[PDB]
Design an enzyme around this catalytic site. Structure first.
Site, PDB file in Angstrom:
ATOM      1  N   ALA A  10       0.831  -1.180   0.000  1.00  0.00           N
ATOM      2  CA  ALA A  10       0.000   0.000   0.000  1.00  0.00           C
ATOM      3  C   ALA A  10       0.880   1.249   0.000  1.00  0.00           C
ATOM      4  CB  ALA A  10      -0.935   0.022   1.209  1.00  0.00           C
ATOM      5  N   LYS A  11       0.282   2.331  -0.461  1.00  0.00           N
ATOM      6  CA  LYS A  11       0.936   3.617  -0.554  1.00  0.00           C
ATOM      7  C   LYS A  11       0.336   4.510   0.528  1.00  0.00           C
ATOM      8  CE  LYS A  11       2.536   2.955  -5.270  1.00  0.00           C
ATOM      9  NZ  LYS A  11       3.567   3.612  -6.107  1.00  0.00           N
ATOM     10  N   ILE A  14       2.059  10.925   2.549  1.00  0.00           N
ATOM     11  CA  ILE A  14       3.075  11.434   3.447  1.00  0.00           C
ATOM     12  C   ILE A  14       2.564  12.552   4.331  1.00  0.00           C
ATOM     13  CG2 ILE A  14       4.939  10.635   2.006  1.00  0.00           C
ATOM     14  CD1 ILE A  14       5.412  13.404   1.020  1.00  0.00           C
ATOM     15  N   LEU A  15       1.430  13.164   3.974  1.00  0.00           N
ATOM     16  CA  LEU A  15       0.801  14.152   4.830  1.00  0.00           C
ATOM     17  C   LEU A  15      -0.558  13.642   5.253  1.00  0.00           C
ATOM     18  CD1 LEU A  15       0.885  16.954   6.035  1.00  0.00           C
ATOM     19  CD2 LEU A  15      -0.084  17.886   4.006  1.00  0.00           C
ATOM     20  N   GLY A  16      -0.767  13.640   6.564  1.00  0.00           N
ATOM     21  CA  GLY A  16      -2.052  13.286   7.145  1.00  0.00           C
ATOM     22  C   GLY A  16      -2.531  14.315   8.168  1.00  0.00           C
ATOM     23  N   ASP A  43      -5.179  10.504  10.921  1.00  0.00           N
ATOM     24  CA  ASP A  43      -4.629   9.794  12.068  1.00  0.00           C
ATOM     25  C   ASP A  43      -5.609   9.910  13.237  1.00  0.00           C
ATOM     26  OD1 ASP A  43      -2.156   8.449  13.312  1.00  0.00           O
ATOM     27  OD2 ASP A  43      -2.736  10.049  14.805  1.00  0.00           O
ATOM     28  N   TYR A  48      -8.633   9.346  21.669  1.00  0.00           N
ATOM     29  CA  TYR A  48      -8.904  10.727  21.331  1.00  0.00           C
ATOM     30  C   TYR A  48     -10.385  11.055  21.548  1.00  0.00           C
ATOM     31  CZ  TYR A  48      -4.258  10.341  19.060  1.00  0.00           C
ATOM     32  OH  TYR A  48      -2.934  10.060  18.788  1.00  0.00           O
ATOM     33  N   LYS A  77      -5.500   3.284  16.431  1.00  0.00           N
ATOM     34  CA  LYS A  77      -4.547   2.763  17.401  1.00  0.00           C
ATOM     35  C   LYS A  77      -5.302   2.033  18.506  1.00  0.00           C
ATOM     36  CE  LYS A  77      -1.877   6.952  16.495  1.00  0.00           C
ATOM     37  NZ  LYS A  77      -2.916   7.990  16.553  1.00  0.00           N
ATOM     38  N   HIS A 110      -0.635   1.603  20.298  1.00  0.00           N
ATOM     39  CA  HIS A 110      -0.463   3.042  20.540  1.00  0.00           C
ATOM     40  C   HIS A 110       0.756   3.362  21.405  1.00  0.00           C
ATOM     41  CE1 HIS A 110      -3.130   6.869  20.865  1.00  0.00           C
ATOM     42  NE2 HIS A 110      -1.856   7.230  20.804  1.00  0.00           N
TER      43      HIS A 110
HETATM   44  N1  LIG Z   1       1.095   8.035  18.637  1.00  0.00           N
HETATM   45  C1  LIG Z   1       1.052   8.901  19.631  1.00  0.00           C
HETATM   46  O1  LIG Z   1       1.327   8.565  20.789  1.00  0.00           O
HETATM   47  C2  LIG Z   1       0.696  10.333  19.341  1.00  0.00           C
HETATM   48  C3  LIG Z   1       1.087  11.332  20.213  1.00  0.00           C
HETATM   49  C4  LIG Z   1       0.843  12.660  19.905  1.00  0.00           C
HETATM   50  C5  LIG Z   1       0.289  13.003  18.682  1.00  0.00           C
HETATM   51  N2  LIG Z   1      -0.095  12.008  17.820  1.00  0.00           N
HETATM   52  C6  LIG Z   1      -0.754  12.344  16.533  1.00  0.00           C
HETATM   53  O2  LIG Z   1      -0.067  13.448  15.915  1.00  0.00           O
HETATM   54  C7  LIG Z   1      -0.985  14.543  15.716  1.00  0.00           C
HETATM   55  C8  LIG Z   1      -0.264  15.869  15.713  1.00  0.00           C
HETATM   56  O3  LIG Z   1       0.383  16.082  16.999  1.00  0.00           O
HETATM   57  P1  LIG Z   1      -0.264  17.072  18.076  1.00  0.00           P
HETATM   58  O4  LIG Z   1      -1.742  17.049  18.005  1.00  0.00           O
HETATM   59  O5  LIG Z   1       0.339  16.681  19.361  1.00  0.00           O
HETATM   60  O6  LIG Z   1       0.298  18.506  17.729  1.00  0.00           O
HETATM   61  P2  LIG Z   1       0.851  19.349  16.492  1.00  0.00           P
HETATM   62  O7  LIG Z   1       0.266  18.854  15.242  1.00  0.00           O
HETATM   63  O8  LIG Z   1       2.326  19.447  16.645  1.00  0.00           O
HETATM   64  O9  LIG Z   1       0.254  20.793  16.896  1.00  0.00           O
HETATM   65  C9  LIG Z   1      -1.178  21.048  16.934  1.00  0.00           C
HETATM   66  C10 LIG Z   1      -1.362  22.446  17.452  1.00  0.00           C
HETATM   67  O10 LIG Z   1      -0.819  23.387  16.516  1.00  0.00           O
HETATM   68  C11 LIG Z   1      -1.850  24.268  16.091  1.00  0.00           C
HETATM   69  N3  LIG Z   1      -1.644  24.573  14.687  1.00  0.00           N
HETATM   70  C12 LIG Z   1      -1.913  23.742  13.638  1.00  0.00           C
HETATM   71  N4  LIG Z   1      -1.611  24.251  12.464  1.00  0.00           N
HETATM   72  C13 LIG Z   1      -1.123  25.516  12.770  1.00  0.00           C
HETATM   73  C14 LIG Z   1      -0.663  26.549  11.944  1.00  0.00           C
HETATM   74  N5  LIG Z   1      -0.597  26.460  10.629  1.00  0.00           N
HETATM   75  N6  LIG Z   1      -0.335  27.722  12.543  1.00  0.00           N
HETATM   76  C15 LIG Z   1      -0.406  27.792  13.886  1.00  0.00           C
HETATM   77  N7  LIG Z   1      -0.788  26.858  14.765  1.00  0.00           N
HETATM   78  C16 LIG Z   1      -1.135  25.729  14.134  1.00  0.00           C
HETATM   79  C17 LIG Z   1      -3.170  23.576  16.396  1.00  0.00           C
HETATM   80  O11 LIG Z   1      -4.175  24.594  16.627  1.00  0.00           O
HETATM   81  P3  LIG Z   1      -5.697  24.398  16.155  1.00  0.00           P
HETATM   82  O12 LIG Z   1      -6.058  22.914  16.049  1.00  0.00           O
HETATM   83  O13 LIG Z   1      -6.533  25.128  17.215  1.00  0.00           O
HETATM   84  O14 LIG Z   1      -5.793  25.120  14.839  1.00  0.00           O
HETATM   85  C18 LIG Z   1      -2.833  22.833  17.673  1.00  0.00           C
HETATM   86  O15 LIG Z   1      -2.872  23.701  18.805  1.00  0.00           O
HETATM   87  C19 LIG Z   1      -2.010  14.309  16.816  1.00  0.00           C
HETATM   88  O16 LIG Z   1      -3.188  15.106  16.639  1.00  0.00           O
HETATM   89  C20 LIG Z   1      -2.223  12.796  16.734  1.00  0.00           C
HETATM   90  O17 LIG Z   1      -3.002  12.499  15.573  1.00  0.00           O
HETATM   91  C21 LIG Z   1       0.144  10.700  18.131  1.00  0.00           C
HETATM   92  O1  LIG Z   2      -1.451   8.985  23.118  1.00  0.00           O
HETATM   93  C1  LIG Z   2      -1.487   9.943  22.291  1.00  0.00           C
HETATM   94  O2  LIG Z   2      -1.609   9.784  21.084  1.00  0.00           O
HETATM   95  C2  LIG Z   2      -1.372  11.362  22.818  1.00  0.00           C
HETATM   96  C3  LIG Z   2      -1.612  11.470  24.309  1.00  0.00           C
HETATM   97  N1  LIG Z   2      -0.529  11.504  25.017  1.00  0.00           N
HETATM   98  N2  LIG Z   2      -0.637  11.585  26.371  1.00  0.00           N
HETATM   99  C4  LIG Z   2       0.659  11.505  27.041  1.00  0.00           C
HETATM  100  C5  LIG Z   2       0.999  10.045  27.258  1.00  0.00           C
HETATM  101  N3  LIG Z   2       2.189   9.599  27.503  1.00  0.00           N
HETATM  102  C6  LIG Z   2       2.197   8.206  27.630  1.00  0.00           C
HETATM  103  C7  LIG Z   2       3.322   7.445  27.986  1.00  0.00           C
HETATM  104  C8  LIG Z   2       3.181   6.066  28.063  1.00  0.00           C
HETATM  105  C9  LIG Z   2       4.396   5.238  28.291  1.00  0.00           C
HETATM  106  F1  LIG Z   2       4.541   4.317  27.276  1.00  0.00           F
HETATM  107  F2  LIG Z   2       4.392   4.591  29.411  1.00  0.00           F
HETATM  108  F3  LIG Z   2       5.522   5.882  28.119  1.00  0.00           F
HETATM  109  C10 LIG Z   2       1.946   5.467  27.799  1.00  0.00           C
HETATM  110  C11 LIG Z   2       0.827   6.202  27.480  1.00  0.00           C
HETATM  111  C12 LIG Z   2       0.952   7.583  27.419  1.00  0.00           C
HETATM  112  S1  LIG Z   2      -0.193   8.796  26.965  1.00  0.00           S
HETATM  113  C13 LIG Z   2      -1.805  11.669  27.098  1.00  0.00           C
HETATM  114  O3  LIG Z   2      -1.774  11.767  28.323  1.00  0.00           O
HETATM  115  C14 LIG Z   2      -3.030  11.574  26.318  1.00  0.00           C
HETATM  116  N4  LIG Z   2      -4.264  11.643  26.925  1.00  0.00           N
HETATM  117  C15 LIG Z   2      -5.313  11.547  26.142  1.00  0.00           C
HETATM  118  C16 LIG Z   2      -5.227  11.387  24.749  1.00  0.00           C
HETATM  119  N5  LIG Z   2      -4.054  11.349  24.127  1.00  0.00           N
HETATM  120  C17 LIG Z   2      -2.920  11.481  24.913  1.00  0.00           C
END
Ligand SMILES: NC(=O)c1ccc[n+]([C@@H]2O[C@H](COP(=O)([O-])OP(=O)(O)OC[C@H]3O[C@@H](n4cnc5c(N)ncnc54)[C@H](OP(=O)(O)O)[C@@H]3O)[C@@H](O)[C@H]2O)c1
Ligand SMILES: O=C(O)Cc1nn(Cc2nc3cc(C(F)(F)F)ccc3s2)c(=O)c2nccnc12
EC number: 1.1.1.21
Length: 315
Positions: A10-11, A14-16, A43, A48, A77, A110
């Site tokens: 799958a493709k 690169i921007l989500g 994503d 969430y 996730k 996750h």
């Molecule tokens: N796997 C994981 O554990 C995990 C952890 C963290 C994040 N994620 C994923 O990554 C995504 C992105 O990370 P994030 O939500 O932490 O933060 P981010 O994308 O780094 O930053 C989002 C913030 O920046 C603002 N913003 C967006 N575009 C902007 C622009 N052009 N100019 C100024 N401000 C701007 C947004 O404001 P507004 O929305 O109010 O416009 C929001 O406050 C998450 O939403 C989630 O899908 C995954």
């Molecule tokens: O998980 C995400 O994608 C973003 C997110 N991050 N965090 C910070 C977290 N940090 C961690 C750290 C761990 C760890 F693996 F133990 F390191 C496990 C789970 C979490 S969740 C929130 O508290 C959190 N709370 C509500 C919803 N999202 C979050």
């Protein structure tokens, strides 16, 4: 170009669009706008607490004939309270029901840490420590593989795994499906050079989360650094007649990463997609990489004694 090949053929765009902290009352409009301006990768996550409202937006645009399902790349996730092998399928089906889809393109573990199963997303003891579950990475992975075999998800991957945790899966005896993606925090203050090199060397695609430094994260302190306000990054943006956000999104794309900036603001959703008409120079790239401080925004103090806590290791 605009998509990276995964191990299933799958493709992946690169921007989500990211959706953490996009409130249910605003996320439907955000997703609709994103699909209208060209996003084809969303994503999502159960934690969430907005998948229903994302699902609404996708359904509406499928019905409007704006996009068809095969043109969309939907990621969700598995949350930490569902690592038990017997809970994984139900968790995936709940996400699919909420999103109103019959399959996901990508489903990630996750976080590598299992939490005590129950109603609470973050089960804490009375001293504020997260309560772990007696689950392990390899058994959870085996349950994730079953989801591919059952046709619920096209690809599986991991998120917030360190290199030893990735290694553990790759070396699993009887491994059926290799992880496609590792989704990690990545931005100029946490450049992740070693873990990206590792994962790319192993043919795992890396997705950069929090690429704007998650200024809306709920535990931000006033004195914390702010990427969007960094005058050095503003200077790079001005040179290209772009915004700081556009530079921060372009940066990971030139490292062959997927990137998932979050906004619910229609103007910014549109702004954030306009990153295919310019290139950062080698100097700009070097300069942004040089801002690394190992400054991590997404971690919880309450999880740091979990056996599978990922961020004690160097990478
Ligand atoms: N796997 C994981 O554990 C995990 C952890 C963290 C994040 N994620 C994923 O990554 C995504 C992105 O990370 P994030 O939500 O932490 O933060 P981010 O994308 O780094 O930053 C989002 C913030 O920046 C603002 N913003 C967006 N575009 C902007 C622009 N052009 N100019 C100024 N401000 C701007 C947004 O404001 P507004 O929305 O109010 O416009 C929001 O406050 C998450 O939403 C989630 O899908 C995954
Ligand atoms: O998980 C995400 O994608 C973003 C997110 N991050 N965090 C910070 C977290 N940090 C961690 C750290 C761990 C760890 F693996 F133990 F390191 C496990 C789970 C979490 S969740 C929130 O508290 C959190 N709370 C509500 C919803 N999202 C979050």
């Amino acid at each position: 170009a605009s998509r990276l090949l995964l191990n299933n053929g799958a493709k992946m765009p690169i921007l989500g669009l990211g959706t953490w902290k996009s409130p249910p009352g605003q996320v439907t409009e955000a997703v609709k706008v994103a699909i209208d301006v060209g996003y084809r990768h969303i994503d999502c996550a159960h934690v969430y607490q907005n998948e229903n409202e994302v699902g609404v937006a996708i359904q509406e645009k499928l019905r409007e004939q704006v996009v068809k399902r095969e043109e969309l790349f939907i990621v969700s996730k598995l949350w930490c309270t569902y690592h038990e092998k017997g809970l994984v399928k139900g968790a995936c089906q709940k996400t699919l029901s909420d999103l109103k889809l019959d399959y996901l393109d990508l489903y990630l573990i996750h976080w590598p840490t299992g939490f005590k199963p129950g109603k609470e997303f973050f089960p804490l003891d009375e001293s504020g420590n997260v309560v772990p579950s007696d689950t392990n990475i390899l058994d959870t992975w085996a349950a994730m593989e079953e989801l591919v075999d059952e046709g619920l998800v096209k690809a599986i991957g991991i998120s917030n795994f360190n290199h030893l945790q990735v290694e553990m899966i790759l070396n699993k005896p009887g491994l059926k499906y290799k992880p496609a993606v590792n989704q990690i925090e990545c931005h100029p203050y946490l450049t992740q050079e070693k873990l990206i090199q590792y994962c790319q060397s192993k043919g795992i695609v890396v997705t950069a989360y929090s690429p704007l430094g998650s200024p809306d994260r709920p535990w931000a302190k006033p004195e914390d650094p702010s990427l969007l306000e960094d005058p050095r990054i503003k200077a790079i943006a001005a040179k290209h007649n772009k915004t700081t956000a556009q530079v921060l999104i372009r940066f990971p794309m030139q490292r062959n990463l997927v990137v998932i900036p979050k906004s619910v603001t229609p103007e910014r959703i549109a702004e954030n997609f306009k990153v295919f008409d310019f290139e950062l120079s080698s100097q700009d790239m070097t300069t942004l990489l040089s801002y690394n401080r190992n400054w991590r925004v997404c971690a919880l103090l309450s999880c740091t004694s979990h056996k599978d806590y990922p961020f004690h290791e160097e990478f």
